[model samples]
Every structure is written in C-alpha cells, then in structure tokens.
Target: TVFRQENVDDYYDTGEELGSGQFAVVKKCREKSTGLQYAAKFIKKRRTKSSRRGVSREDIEREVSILKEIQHPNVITLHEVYENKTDVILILELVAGGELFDFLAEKESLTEEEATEFLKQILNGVYYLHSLQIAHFDLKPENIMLLDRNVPKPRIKIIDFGLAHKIDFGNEFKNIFGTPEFVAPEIVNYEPLGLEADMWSIGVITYILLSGASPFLGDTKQETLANVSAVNYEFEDEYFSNTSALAKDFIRRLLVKDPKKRMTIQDSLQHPWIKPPQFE
Candidate 1:
C-alpha cells in the first residue's frame, strides 16, 4: 500500500547528499512539479541477513506508512514513497536545525525557561502519539530536531519512528533495544513496554537539559546497564545547583522505576515546569 512503482529519480531532483550511514542514505531533493524540498531517504534492501547488512527486515515500509495518517506540528511528516529493486525511497520532511542539543550547545548560555520551551514541543508531540496508543520507543536527543535553527523559536520536530509501535491489547509488546543512557528499567530488564516507557526518556531528557550530565551513565556499557537497572542517579550541586525545585520534582515523578508509578503525559502537562500556562 505504501510503495509507488515509479522511479524516484524521475520525479525528484536529487540535490546534494545530506546523510549516508547504516542501511540508509538521505539526500535533499525537490519535487519536479511543485519544486518543494524533501529529504529522500533511500533504505537499502540487502541480499542476505549477515552482520552490518542493509535493512532487509520487512515492515519498514509499514513503519513509514504510519506517518501517512499523521499530521502533527511536532512530528516528522512524509510526502510519498518510491521503490526500486534495491531501495525503498522515503521522501521525508527535511529538518534543517539538526539535533536538539547541538543547536543549544552553540549558544553561550541557556535559561531554564528556554530549556523547558524545547521540552514543551516534545511533550505536545508525545501527547498526540499517546492519544492514539502509539509509543515512541526511541525518544532521544538525536531523534528530536529543529525544523529551522535560525528562527527565534525554532520548531521542534520529533523524528525517527523505526522503534515506535501502536500498542495492542493482547500482544504485551516487549523489546530490549534502546540507547542505554535514556532507556527505562523495564526495557533494560526486558519487561513489557507501554506508553509510560516514553515518559522515562522525557524525564532523562529533562535531567540532561537542566544538568549537562546523563543520569545513569557509567564507565562501560555493562556498567551503564548496571547503573540504569539500579536506578542510581542524584542531583548534585555540581550540575543541578541552579536548577529549581519544581523542575526537579517534575523529573522526579517521571524517573520512578515502576511504570505504574511513573507520571503520565497528562500529569506532566499539568506540572508547573512543563505547563504552558505557568510558563507564560
């Protein structure tokens, strides 16, 4: 239902290459008719299932098709799809501002207000997803990007849906794949995951933005997993000296070990730190 038989190159004027890594290649392109810009992501189809092979697993097109039913201001948008023998071409919305942290890292100083502003967009986007029972399993700084960096308040666009899934009743979806630093304990322990898992990442994201250090990071990968599983993190004066109590309280609610205990998206939206009304 997603793939179009037409040649992608025939319709899009492929501009300079934007990115190339793993099993995909992204390039800036323009539609022949409207001349509109898009990032053409070419997902390669490998011949075998060897190590470091291209993305041969099915449902990738299915993954891309999820965006077809979506139209959110903060989430990534898709234009159309094209297929060839070796690649499934995805014409993605080009996010020019780069990763979330990279944009702020360039600035000399950042205020708590400014930091929460960035988090607000993500919360809004995630709220929309949670409404539909979709959990963005991978919620990291790399996946959160700005549509245009030059503007005063660059729009935040949550990208990368490869790990996302629409939760079903009987399936009890569980997975052990996620960045160690940001993943919840359930994910590290191989417990069933749900919408609450994303809240934990948001908690971790808030911690890092307020304090430059990651909460459960360790010297090695095993060490990091140990730290995460143990839920060992503290707000020290070294990094959190300037951070406020309400903000810390907000992060505290989401960082709970039990998914049932973790703050829901509704609770977070009402919290003063992330509440738009309090912010104004």
Candidate 2:
C-alpha cells in the first residue's frame, strides 16, 4: 500500500509501447534514479460522460489495492501509480518474454518435464491468490508469460487481474466472466462460481499444454459452450496415446462438473503430476 501517487513525468521516462488492450496501453519506462526498466500500463479514464467505457474507477482502485498486497515470485509486482485527469498509469514488473501461447505454438515439442515445471509454478501462484480469497476468473495461456524466452528453465508470471475477485468460502458469483472454451460448466450454466472455476480453467490449460489442442473447442461458440456445460471432452488416442495416465487423471480431477469434487489447489500441488520426482 506504500505505492505513492505521483506525476508520471517525475519518475519515469516513457519508452516504446509494450502492448495494448481496450482500456489500457502498456509501455516501457525507466526510473529516473534507479534506471531500472518497468512496464507502465496507461489506462484511459472515462473523463467525459459520452466516453463512458472500459473499467470503472472503482475497479482500477480494487486491482491496484490487491496488487499491492500480493507478493510472490510468480505474480507481477506493482511498482507505482500515477494519475492525471484523463489517464491512470500503473508501473508494473517488465516481463520481457512473450506470452506462453507464443512459446507453445513455436516449440516443436514441449516436453512433459517442461510442462510440469510451468504448471507447478502456475499452481503455486494460484494457490497464493486463493489463500488470500482472490479468484482469478480468467486463466489462460495468453495471461501467462515467460520471464525469459531463451532460458531452458524459463520462469512463468501470471498477469492480468481484470476478472479477478475476492470471495468468501461457500459464496457463489453470478457474473458470467471468462473465455468460452476455458470457462467452467458452472459459469456456462450461470451458476454461482468460486475458486473451483479457476481450477477448471487450469485443467483446460493443462490439457492444451499436454496435447497442444483445445479440449472443449468446437467449430462454433455455441458448440463450445455446449461441450463445456456437458463436460464433453476426451483424451483422443491421437493426442493421449503417448500421454501418461497420471497426466490424464490430473486433468480429469479438475474438469469435474461438481465444484466440491474438483481438485483444490493444495490437492493439485500434491498430485503425482505436480510433485517432484523421487529418486531411488
């Protein structure tokens, strides 16, 4: 919570654009004294009544407050906040490596060991968030980023808290938020959702990592939603013929229709696929 609100010009020299979304544009920035690089996410505030779009002021405030309290190696750090009449700028950890999707798409064959490492880190980060009662409604490959593209043991950082929310145990959220293919059945049914929804997404991400294919994707969005609602998917012989049984079991545990039956983050961390190998 120590992040001070200051003039953007007072601290950083804005550089090249990093990326852009509907509401914000992330750019490279350097600290005036430390010279260390960071990514500055400049969110366009809805200043005029006619241009009322994107995230509201309350949403941005909540995100910043949550980021301030979250301290983990796998989570992106928020450095500072700067705001003007029209723009709210957030200084964040600069992750140079590209999105996880790009890495998977480019790699000829992503080994099981590599996939396990990435998933383990992701679980650790998610577990931390869950411990704080935060549910990251949006979890997908695009939201995951590698710290270094060329490293053999690249570190993964989970980014984007646009759809994240804090929840109490037994509480169900009604808002239908998430990507169609990766969304849980509860979300598709418009049922109240909680941490289990995120676990469902992790299952989808794992399925993709192991098979390099979407488990629930159909030719159309309607079909995809239908598959999700029905929990209709399989480890086709073409993709799972070589995948280990333990891996299949891991995916199955998280993809369960009942939230209570779905694997918890702790259970996932202890799963055979996630635990470090034992040497004889």
What does each candidate score in C-alpha RMSD? 5.2, 5.9
Q: Residue 130 of candidate 2: its Cα lDDT?
A: 94
TM-score of every candidate? 0.91, 0.92
Candidate number with greatest lDDT: 2
TM-score of model 1 (CA atoms): 0.91
Compared with the true structure, what per-residue lDDT tens digits does model 1 show for residues 1-280?
A: 5488798878989888866666778888999999899989888877676735666455475468567766899999998888887888889998877888687567733567877888889999999988888788889887898988887777899987877777766124545367888888888888888989999999998888877778998877777777878889999887888888998999999999999999999899999877760010
Please give the CA lDDT of all the candidate structures: 0.82, 0.86
Q: Residue by residue across 164-220, what tens digits does model 2's lDDT show?
A: 777875556556467888899998888898889999999999999888999999888
